[PDB]
Amino acid sequence: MPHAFKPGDLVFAKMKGYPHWPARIDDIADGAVKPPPNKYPIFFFGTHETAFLGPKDLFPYDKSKDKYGKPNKRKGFNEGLWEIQNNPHASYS
C-alpha cells in the first residue's frame, strides 16, 4: 500500500494551465522557507522552479509516466523528462 509523500518521491505535478510536469518532492534545508501546512515543496525538473502543492496535484511517477512522460512544446519540459529519468536526485542548484 501507498505511504504518505516523502522528500525524494518522484511525481508528475499539476498546476493550472500547465501540462502534468516531471517533479520531485524536495527536502527543506535547515534555515529555508517552509511550505504552508498540508503543502509539499515541489521541485520541477527542467525549469528548476519550486512551488508548494498538496497531494491532489501530485501523481506518482511510476504509475503515471506512460500517460504523462511524452515530449511537450513547453519551455524546459523535455529537459525535465531527461532529469527525472536520468538523475532525479541530483543537485540542480
From Swiss-Prot:
This is Hepatoma-derived growth factor-related protein 2. Changing W21A: Loss of interaction with histone H3K36me2. The chain holds residues 1 to 93 of 671 of the full protein. It comes from the Eukaryota. The gene is HDGFL2. Interacts with HDGF. Interacts with trimethylated 'Lys-36' of histone H3 (H3K36me3). Interacts with trimethylated 'Lys-79' of histone H3 (H3K79me3), but has higher affinity for H3K36me3. Interacts with IWS1. Interacts with H2AX, POGZ, RBBP8 and CBX1. Interacts with histones H3K9me3, H3K27me3 and H3K36me2. Interacts with DPF3a (isoform 2 of DPF3/BAF45C). Interacts with SMARCA4/BRG1/BAF190A, SMARCC1/BAF155 and SMARCD1/BAF60A in a DPF3a-dependent manner. It is found in: Nucleus; Cytoplasm. Widely expressed. High expression is found in heart, skeletal muscle, ovary and testis. Overexpression is frequently observed in hepatocellular carcinoma samples. Residues 7-64 form the PWWP domain. Acts as an epigenetic regulator of myogenesis in cooperation with DPF3a (isoform 2 of DPF3/BAF45C). Associates with the BAF complex via its interaction with DPF3a and HDGFL2-DPF3a activate myogenic genes by increasing chromatin accessibility through recruitment of SMARCA4/BRG1/BAF190A (ATPase subunit of the BAF complex) to myogenic gene promoters. Promotes the repair of DNA double-strand breaks (DSBs) through the homologous recombination pathway by facilitating the recruitment of the DNA endonuclease RBBP8 to the DSBs. Belongs to the HDGF family.
